[PDB]
């Protein structure tokens, strides 16, 4: 059984039920990060976070005793089966081609028979985090797996937002004073040519 140190659990039959997902997707990460630098180079794209492209196997725990807990009788094979961000990759580029890098990455992924499960193309909003993460589905092995396209001064603002985040989510001594703190950053970051327009690839 699975200890989640912070008030969680798991038992062994659900805990042996994920450490097989763990090296399950791990064989799949093999032919999606062939196909995803694939894109990141055939479109000059940086690849950031490919370190960590694989999602901790504590971290996949806690998100799943937290959803066996929002919702019983859920069974960890249906919880397991909606995790999108198990891996994960972050696509870089100058603000000139960012959107055509993205329309590029998208359509190579979409030909080789992967599928679009989400597009979080939040660049035309005036207020929020700017961005578009996306999810996809392995064609044969069924994985589901992330990739968030930022440039560089879109991925400083979550390199610098979370340190907001963290004072201000937290209620030790704390908040909306950093709410405009935070999207002072987001409209400080520009928005290229046509990344409020983009859309996910139909295959």
């Known amino acids: 059984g699975w200890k989640g140190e912070g008030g969680l659990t798991l038992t062994g039959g659900e805990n042996n039920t994920v450490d097989a997902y763990v090296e399950r997707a791990r064989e799949a990460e093999r032919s999606i990060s062939v196909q995803v630098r694939a894109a ?59 959107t055509s890098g993205v329309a590029t990455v998208a359509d190579t992924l979409a030909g080789w028979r992967n599928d679009s499960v989400k597009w979080s193309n939040t660049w035309g909003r005036a207020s929020g985090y700017k961005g578009l993460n996306t999810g996809w589905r392995a064609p044969r092995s069924g994985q589901l797996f992330e990739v968030q396209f930022h440039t560089e001064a879109s991925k400083k603002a979550q390199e610098t937002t979370h340190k907001l985040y963290e004072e201000q989510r937290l209620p030790s001594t704390g908040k909306q004073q950093l709410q405009r703190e935070q999207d002072a950053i987001f409209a400080a970051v520009p928005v290229p040519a046509g990344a409020d327009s983009l859309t996910a690839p139909v295959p």
């Open 40 to 98: 990141a180079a055939m479109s000059e794209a940086e690849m950031v976070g490919f370190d960590q492209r694989l999602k901790s196997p504590d971290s996949l725990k806690r998100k799943v005793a937290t959803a066996l807990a929002e919702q019983p009788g859920r069974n960890v094979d249906t919880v397991l089966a909606g995790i999108t961000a198990a891996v994960r990759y972050t696509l870089q580029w100058d603000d000139a081609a960012y």
